[PDB]
Design a binder for these strands. Structure first.
Ligand code: MG
Ligand code: MG
Ligand code: MG
Ligand code: MG
Ligand code: MG
Ligand code: MG
Ligand code: MG
Ligand code: MG
Ligand code: MG
Ligand code: MG
Ligand code: MG
Ligand code: MG
Ligand code: MG
Ligand code: MG
Ligand code: ZN
Lengths: 142, 36, 141, 140, 184
RNA sequence: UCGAUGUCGGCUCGUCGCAUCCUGGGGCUGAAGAAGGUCCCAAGGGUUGGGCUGUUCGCCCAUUAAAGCGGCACGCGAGCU
RNA sequence: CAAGUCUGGGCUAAGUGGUAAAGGAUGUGGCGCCGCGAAGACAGCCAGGAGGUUGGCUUAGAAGCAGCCAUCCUUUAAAGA
C-alpha cells in the first residue's frame, strides 16, 4: 500500500448540539452552542466549546477527530505490520539462517543443511541456488 | 412499493388505477407498486 | 474540474435571464440533441455528472458533444457572517442557459442508446428538457 | 440434438476420457455411469483420430443411450485449414490466420451430413460466417 | 417538388402565421413578392426536401416557378419556422449546398471510433439543369487517426464548387471510453 | 416591546402534532419455524429506577414490551426553586 | 347580501375550484401524421417454436441468458449467433 487518504464522509458521524457550559450571558443559556461529533463505527466522541458558534465548533471538532484518527488509523498500519513481518530477528548467538566462514572456507545453510565451499564466491551475488533451496525448505512445511 | 415515480419494471408489468391512486399489478410481488 | 484556465476578472455581477436563447438553437453537430426548456444557471458539477452519466450508460461507443461552458463565477459568503464587508468568494462556476439552448449532442450511437442516454442526462439538470433529431436545423447557408 | 427431459450433448476430448475435468461428472448429475462411456465408448474415439469429438448422450434412466457420434465442431476443423490453435481473443479485421477461397472447400469433404445442404456451395457460405467469428482471414 | 402559394398583401404578419399561413418572400435580381404558404404542406414538403431540391410555386397566376430556399428563420423557444426566403431561378448558374452521402465503413469502426461528418452538405456553383443529388464519397479507407477532408472528392462534370479546398468535410475520431476519472 | 416582554436547568401541572419507541393490522423479504429487516395504515393508551455532572445533551449500572422524537415565549418563577 | 338560480356553445368528477416543484400514470376530451387491416393477429385460442452452433475468447462453468469481440450464412411457413 502507498496512498494516504482518510476522507471521513459525514455518513457514519452522529453530531449532537448540547447547550454551552460555563460563562456567557443570555446567549450561552439560549443558544445550542456546544457540539459533540460522535464516530459511530468506532465509539470515539470529540467535543468543542472553545468558540461561540456551532458551525465553527463542529468544524473545529473535525479538525481534531481527523487528527486523533490520523494517529489511531496509522497505529494499526504499524500493528498490522509488526506481526506481518515474521519473528526471526533476535540477532543473538544461536539464531542464524546461514553461516559464512572464510577461515576453513565454507558456507553453511542452517535451514537446508547444505555446506558450500565457496564463501568468497557467494559474496559476489551467486545466490540463485541457496534461494532455490530456501524456497523449497520454507514453502514445504505449510 | 410506495414511491413518487411509478413505472413498469418487467414485460409482464401492468399499470392499474384503483381507488383514485395509480397502482402496478404483476406476477412476482417485488414488482407491486402504489403511487403515493 | 471544468473551469476556465484564465480570466481577466475574478468576481462578476449576477445579472438576469430574459427569455430566448439568442444563439445555439440548432443542432449543427451530432444526430440527437438535448434542448433546455427552462432558464437557469448550470453548475460545472451538473455538466460533469451528466457527461459521465452518458459514457457510463453506453460505455465504449459514440462521441459526445458538450455545447455549453461554465464561465460565470458564483459567489457565496461564508456561514454565520453578516451582510456587507465586500463581495463573497467564488464557490464554483456556472453556465447561463436559456430556453431553446441545445446543451448536448450525441453521434455514432443507436437511436435507442441515444434516447435513453439523454433521458438520463435530463434527470441531472435543475430544469426540464426535450430531445430532438436533426432536419431543419441546417443553417449552413 | 434429439429429445428432451433428460439428455446432454458434449464435445469429448480424444485419446483419454473417464475422469471429471471435461464434463465427466456433469452427465452423472443428470443421470449417467462410469462403466458405460469410457472404454466401451472409445471404440469410436480410437478411430476418429484426435482433437475434439462432438459425440453426445441421451438418458433413459437405465444405462441406455443414443450415443450418436458427430463431426468435429466447425471451431476446430478450421484450426486445421489455417493452423492457429485458438482463433483470436476478439475477432474482427485483425487475425493471426489466413484462409484462401478454396481453403473453405477443403473442409467440405469433412462436414457433409446433417449440415442441411448436400452440396458444397450451399453449405460453405455457412462456414464463411464462422470465418468472422474466430477471425481467420479470407485471402482476397 | 410542387406546392401551392398565395399572394400576401402585407397585412398582420403575426396573425397570418397563426391562422395557418406561413409568411415568406420570393425574390431574385428582378422582382420580389411577399407571400403566405400554409405550414401544413410546407412542413411536410420542407422536411422531405430541404434547400437542395427545387420547388414549384403555383400562384393565382398559374405561374409555376422553380425556386430554392435560402433563409428559414426559426422561432427559438419551441421549434417552429417564422420566415422563408425563396430564390427564383431561370438558367443562371448559381450556388447551393448539395447533400452528401458517405458510403463506406471507415477502418475507424473496429477498435473504437465514430464518423463526424462535419460539412455533410457542400456549397457548389452550377446551373439549374445541372442539379444532382447524393454526391457520395468513400469512407471505406478512413483510418482511426488521420482522416480525409477538403474538397478532395468526385465532383461530377459541372460541379464548380466554392470551398478552399481545405474545409474538413468529415473525420474519424476515437470513442468515449468509460476509463476516465482524475483531479489534481 | 428598552416610562421593562425575568433569561438555563430541575420540580409541579399538563396538552397538542406524527415524520410512531412499544402494543394493534398489513405488503414484501436474500420470510422454512422462531426471531429479524424495510415500508404502509394507525396515537387510543403507555413510555421505569439509579451513579456522574448545575446541566439540557450524554456515558454507565439493573430492568423493560418500549424506555419515541417534537410544539406549546427551546410551555409553565403574579406556581416553586 | 343589493342586483340573472338569464340566454347560446363547450371543458372538469377532483370539493379540483378553495396553496406548491422536479417527476410519474391506457384519467378524460379534441386535434396530428405514420403504420398495418380478405400476403383479413389487434388480443386470446391449435401447433410449431430448427441446424452449423456450445461462435470465438475469457472462465470452476460462461452451452443464446457473467462479461469482451464479430455478428454473417444455411434449411424453411417461420425461428435471433
Ligand atoms: Mg449563424
Ligand atoms: Mg408599560
Ligand atoms: Mg410590566
Ligand atoms: Mg411485517
Ligand atoms: Mg416469521
Ligand atoms: Mg402515518
Ligand atoms: Mg453516594
Ligand atoms: Mg412534551
Ligand atoms: Mg428557539
Ligand atoms: Mg407566569
Ligand atoms: Mg420568583
Ligand atoms: Mg408573589
Ligand atoms: Mg337578494
Ligand atoms: Mg381546497
Ligand atoms: Zn414485473
Amino acid at each position: 500500500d502507498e496512498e494516504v487518504e482518510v476522507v471521513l464522509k459525514p455518513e457514519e458521524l452522529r453530531i449532537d448540539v448540547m447547550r454551552a457550559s460555563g460563562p456567557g450571558g443570555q446567549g450561552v443559556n439560549t443558544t445550542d452552542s456546544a457540539v459533540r461529533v460522535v464516530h459511530l463505527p468506532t465509539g470515539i466522541t470529540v467535543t468543542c466549546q472553545t468558540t461561540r458558534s456551532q458551525i465553527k465548533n463542529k468544524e473545529l471538532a473535525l479538525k481534531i477527530l481527523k487528527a486523533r484518527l490520523y494517529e489511531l488509523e496509522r497505529k494499526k498500519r504499524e500493528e498490522e505490520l509488526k506481526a506481518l513481518r515474521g519473528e526471526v530477528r533476535p540477532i543473538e548467538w544461536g539464531s542464524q539462517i546461514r553461516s559464512y566462514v572464510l577461515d576453513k572456507n565454507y558456507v553453511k545453510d542452517h535451514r537446508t543443511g547444505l555446506m558450500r565451499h565457496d564463501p568468497e564466491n557467494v559474496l559476489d551475488g551467486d545466490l540463485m541456488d541457496l534461494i532455490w533451496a530456501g524456497l523449497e525448505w520454507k514453502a514445504g512445511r505449510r | 412499493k410506495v414511491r413518487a415515480s411509478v413505472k413498469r419494471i418487467c414485460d409482464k408489468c401492468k399499470v392499474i388505477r384503483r381507488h383514485g391512486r395509480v397502482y402496478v399489478i404483476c406476477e412476482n410481488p417485488k414488482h407491486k407498486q402504489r403511487q403515493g | 474540474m471544468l473551469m476556465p484556465r484564465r480570466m481577466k476578472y475574478r468576481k462578476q455581477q449576477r445579472g438576469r435571464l430574459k427569455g430566448a436563447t439568442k444563439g445555439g438553437d440548432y443542432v449543427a453537430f451530432g444526430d440527437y440533441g438535448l434542448v433546455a426548456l427552462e432558464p437557469a444557471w448550470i453548475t460545472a458539477q451538473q455538466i460533469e455528472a451528466a457527461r459521465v452519466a452518458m459514457v457510463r450508460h453506453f460505455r465504449r461507443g459514440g462521441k459526445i458533444f458538450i455545447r455549453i461552458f461554465p464561465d460565470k463565477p458564483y459567489t457565496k459568503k461564508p456561514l454565520e457572517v453578516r451582510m456587507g464587508k465586500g463581495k463573497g468568494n467564488v464557490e464554483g462556476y456556472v453556465a447561463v442557459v436559456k430556453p431553446g439552448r441545445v446543451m448536448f449532442e450525441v453521434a455514432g450511437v443507436t437511436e435507442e442508446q441515444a434516447m435513453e442516454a439523454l433521458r438520463i442526462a435530463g434527470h441531472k439538470l435543475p430544469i426540464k428538457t426535450k430531445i430532438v433529431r436533426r432536419d431543419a436545423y441546417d443553417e449552413a447557408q | 440434438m434429439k429429445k428432451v427431459v433428460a439428455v446432454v450433448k458434449l464435445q469429448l476430448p480424444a485419446g483419454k476420457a473417464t475422469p471429471a475435468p471435461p464434463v465427466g461428472p456433469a452427465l452423472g448429475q443428470h443421470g449417467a455411469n462410469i462403466m458405460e462411456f469410457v472404454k466401451a465408448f472409445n471404440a469410436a474415439t480410437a478411430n476418429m483420430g484426435d482433437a475434439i469429438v462432438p459425440v453426445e448422450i441421451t438418458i433413459y434412466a437405465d444405462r441406455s443411450f443414443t450415443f450418436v457420434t458427430k463431426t468435429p465442431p466447425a471451431s476446430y476443423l478450421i484450426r486445421k485449414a489455417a493452423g492457429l490453435e485458438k482463433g483470436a481473443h476478439k475477432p474482427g479485421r485483425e487475425k493471426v490466420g489466413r484462409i484462401t477461397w478454396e481453403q473453405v472447400l477443403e473442409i467440405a469433404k469433412q462436414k457433409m451430413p446433417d449440415l442441411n445442404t448436400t452440396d458444397l456451395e450451399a453449405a460453405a457460405r455457412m462456414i464463411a460466417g464462422s470465418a468472422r467469428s474466430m477471425g481467420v482471414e479470407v485471402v482476397g | 417538388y410542387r406546392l401551392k402559394a398565395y399572394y400576401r398583401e402585407g397585412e398582420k404578419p403575426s396573425a397570418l402565421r397563426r391562422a395557418g399561413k406561413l409568411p415568406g418572400v420570393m425574390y431574385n435580381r428582378h422582382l420580389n413578392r411577399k407571400v403566405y404558404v400554409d405550414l401544413v404542406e410546407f412542413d411536410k414538403v420542407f422536411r422531405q426536401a430541404s434547400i437542395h431540391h427545387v420547388i414549384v410555386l403555383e400562384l393565382p397566376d398559374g405561374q409555376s416557378l422553380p425556386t430554392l430556399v435560402r433563409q428559414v428563420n426559426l422561432d427559438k423557444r419551441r421549434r417552429r419556422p417564422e420566415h422563408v426566403d425563396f430564390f427564383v431561378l431561370s438558367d443562371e448558374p448559381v450556388e447551393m449546398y448539395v447533400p452528401l452521402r458517405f458510403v463506406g465503413t471507415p477502418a475507424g469502426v473496429r477498435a473504437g471510433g465514430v464518423l463526424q461528418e462535419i460539412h455533410r452538405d457542400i456549397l457548389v456553383k452550377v446551373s439549374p439543369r445541372n442539379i444532382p443529388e447524393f454526391i457520395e464519397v468513400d469512407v471505406s479507407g478512413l483510418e482511426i487517426g488521420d482522416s480525409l477532408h477538403a474538397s478532395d472528392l468526385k465532383l461530377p462534370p459541372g460541379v464548380e464548387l466554392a470551398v478552399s479546398p481545405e474545409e474538413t468535410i468529415a473525420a474519424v475520431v476515437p470513442p468515449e471510453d468509460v476509463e476516465k476519472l482524475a483531479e489534481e
